Ligand SMILES: Cc1ncc(CNc2cncc(F)c2)s1
Ligand SMILES: Cc1ncc(CNc2cncc(F)c2)s1
Ligand SMILES: [Zn+2]
């Protein structure tokens with residue numbers, strides 16, 4: 272305990288020797304509280320003007336406008352230790368699942384070279400400012416790496432000095448860049464080498480992309496079974512048990528040499544024992560500790576969430592199939608039965624699921640799954656917005672299943688070929704495009720973010736009448752050659768490019784689409800179909816409203832307003848790619 276965190280604590284305590292005070296009115300119960308010290312400082316959303324000026328009808332939709340305005344009593348929760356039978360079910364399943372993921376993969380260390388490219392082309396690794404300004408600067412230096420080396424040698428010693436989280440249903444724990452590297456060195460392979468790919472994991476979708484998710488849900492639908500189940504967990508990261516953290520750590524069993532010790536240290540020191548600096552305006556910096564809950568990089572979090580979610584869902588399948596009778600204790604015969612289930616049908620059972628971190632869709636063997644709730648509830652993976660022992664409401668139609676904030680439509684092209692297209696409430700799409708994260712943006716940068724959104728809409732949401740039109744308008748209003756930008760790059764972002772959008776559509780939807788047998792390129796945008804105009808209205812379209820018809824009719828005037836603001840640049844008119852504007 273304090274042997275493992277004390278060094279980290281004692282080091283912080285000393286850098287504020289004229290401040291340290293053990294405030295006796297600290298609000299922590301579930302989190303251990305060590306002390307405090309003096310600080311004073313805070314990033315709200317800004318509106319993207321290029322997008323808003325070209326989406327005027329939406330200036331009066333409260334669902335769009337409210338998205339741009341404005342529980343920490345959930346992070347301070349505690350989950351009960353699972354029963355012995357639950358713990359055995361999890362240990363056995365975790366062992367078998369690491370083996371399966373490892374069959375065609377080699378754990379390996381990631382390198383500074385790799386980490387250095389990441390920071391120069393910008394991911395969201397989540398660092399802090401201090402001694403160097405940006406993340407870009409500290410990597411270019413040589414002193415930072417000497418710091419890294421020190422901590423690394425300490426990790427091999429089995430101690431830790433500077434790996435401390437900073438808190439800030441979305442609470443992010445940013446770490447200093449050095450700690451991020453040591454985490455990425457040890458565990459980056461999980462993301463970098465696609466361990467949770469559909470090919471390697473059977474349930475996973477890592478790197479598959481929105482244009483593939485709908486086809487994958489449909490492939491699951493083709494299996495014999497009962498309803499499709501899509502239970503969200505109530506605050507998944509706050510319900511990761513120490514038992515989950517120990518079963519994740521069994522990935523080190525597949526490692527060797529330096530890598531194995533470095534990985535064990537990350538699991539032992541930064542995951543199974545955590546030290547966090549949280550601000551408290553009453554402004555002190557509280558130094559609290561905790562062994563449980565999900566702390567890690569957003570990207571290792573994703574891989575370990577997918578892993579533990581796969582594990583829980585295999586066990587819920589086992590329960591619905593009556594592989595084990597009770598979670599209180601597992602008979603020696605029940606252990607063998609579980610083990611032989613995994614060996615005999617485990618891979619088939621994984622192919623019945625689509626899992627993206629804390630998000631899942633299961634098509635179990637039959638509807639017994641709906642009331643198989645004892646293992647799920649005991650593991651602490653308590654379902655959101657339904658009573659604890661109330662049976663799951665399944666879905667009969669794969670086109671109604673929620674997954675990764677989307678639903679999927681089946682859409683028939685004029686030539687018989689079949690698109691499965693992603694979709695969500697259009698107010699959600701327009702409200703997100705109207706928002707820029709960070710201030711300090713030039714007109715040019717703001718314009719290039721709008722163009723990223725426009726190109727995503729043309730690629731993913733082309734079947735929505737208002738999004739094809741607004742996307743054509745934004746791309747007409749931003750200089751033809753200006754490059755699309757984004758301040759967090761997830762899966763596959765084929766819209767981040769200066770190439771012709773019809774050429775990308777053809778590559779993504781026809782050429783590279785393994786569900787399309789005929790590879791005939793499409794020759795214009797008019798070949799590319801829309802949802803039915805009632806289906807479009809159901810998913811939030813403004814077609815049929817007066818405000819919308821005036822906007823479409825007078826779009827060239829909105830385009831010209833934005834062209835005037837940006838200035839005398841080279842523009843393309845994309846509106847004639849649509850039938851109604853083609854004279
Ligand atoms: C790291 C990931 N790999 C695939 C994912 C599936 N989810 C998704 C959501 N939004 C846009 C996407 F391209 C994909 S998440
Ligand atoms: C219920 C409605 N019936 C026709 C409408 C007009 N909206 C529209 C726009 N572009 C292409 C279309 F097929 C239809 S709204
Ligand atoms: Zn450390």
Ligand SMILES: [Zn+2]
Nearest residue numbers: 678694695810
């Ligand atoms: Zn829809």
